Amino acid sequence: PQITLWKRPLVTIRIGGQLKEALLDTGADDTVLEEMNLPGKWKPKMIGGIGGFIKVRQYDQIPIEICGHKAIGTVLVGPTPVNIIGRNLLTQIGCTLNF
Amino acid sequence: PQITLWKRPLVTIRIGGQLKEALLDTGADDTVLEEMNLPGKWKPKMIGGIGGFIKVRQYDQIPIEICGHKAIGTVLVGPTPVNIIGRNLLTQIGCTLNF
Ligand SMILES: COC(=O)N[C@H](C(=O)N[C@@H](Cc1ccccc1)[C@@H](O)CN(Cc1ccc(-c2ccccn2)cc1)NC(=O)[C@@H](NC(=O)OC)C(C)(C)C)C(C)(C)C
């Protein structure tokens, strides 16, 4: 589909078979989800945004669907105010910017 | 153009006669540039992202040419880690997400 940018490009994602709303973010290197009690091993990571860095848990090879398109990759979990789909997953679903 | 996302979507912009590199950022409500001089009266404001809030200077009705496409809109200036073109200007240049 095509998504205009008049409002925040929020779309439905599925992780662990459950649904969330997330921002399709071309300014994000990584995918960062709001605190959730995801199972499995993880590694500590620090990621930086406009106001500084936060601590996240890095989970690898996690299946996700984004607007019905399947993807699999690294998902960071931490105290973000918004679920963010970053370029690591946007490439997998064939997402481009166009003007 | 059509821009894929295996790299950061940086483009050349012209603003106040000067050339800069900036990130086409669908996850940004606002356009935020690194500390610089711009003509006109600015209003103090605060914006937040991951890592928290920063203080910026809000300049209104500022022309920027973004990858050959003209826009005139609100530009925030402050200690952002990267020059960011947000949705306020992406809409002006007719930018959309597609997959
Ligand atoms: C409603 O608030 C906003 O729209 N906030 C925007 C904002 O922060 N957007 C974030 C997503 C977001 C939205 C709302 C609340 C919280 C977060 C991103 O679209 C843009 N941002 C812009 C940005 C991009 C890079 C960097 C950076 C950090 C350290 C070193 C180099 N670059 C900082 C900010 N990117 C990042 O922060 C990403 N960082 C990143 O990719 O780092 C490599 C994350 C996400 C992976 C953490 C602005 C402050 C830019 C206007």
Residue of A nearest to B79 (CA): A50
Residue A24 Cα distances to A47, B49, B73, angstroms = 18, 15, 23
Quote the CA–CA distance of B25 and B58 in Å, as a whole number: 18
Nearest CA in chain A to B87: A5
User: Distance between CA atoms of A28 and A76, rounded to whole angstroms?
Assistant: 12
A60 has catalytic annotation: no
Half-sphere exposure in the Cβ direction for A22 (13 Å, CA): 29
A54 contacts chain B (CB < 8 A):
yes
DSSP state, residue B89: H
Burial A21-35 (b: 16+ CB within 10 A, else e): ebbbbbbbebbbbee
Resolution of this structure in Å: 1.8
Domain count, chain B: 1
How many CB atoms neighbour CB B52 within 10 A? Answer: 13
Q: Which two tokens stand for residue B14?
A: 């012209």
Q: Which of A23, A53, A98 sits opposite B98 (nearest CB)?
A: A98
Residue A74 belongs to domain spanning: 1-99
Return the structure tokens found at B23: 């990130």
Alpha-carbon span A52 to B78, nearest angstrom: 13
Tokens read off for B49:
């992202």
- Please report, as a single letter, which amino acid is at residue A16: G
- Using a 10 angstrom Cβ sphere, with 0-12 exposed, 13-18 middle and 19 or more buried, the burial of residue B59 is buried
Distance CA B59, CA B48 (A): 17
| CATH code of the domain in which A43 resides | 2.40.70.10
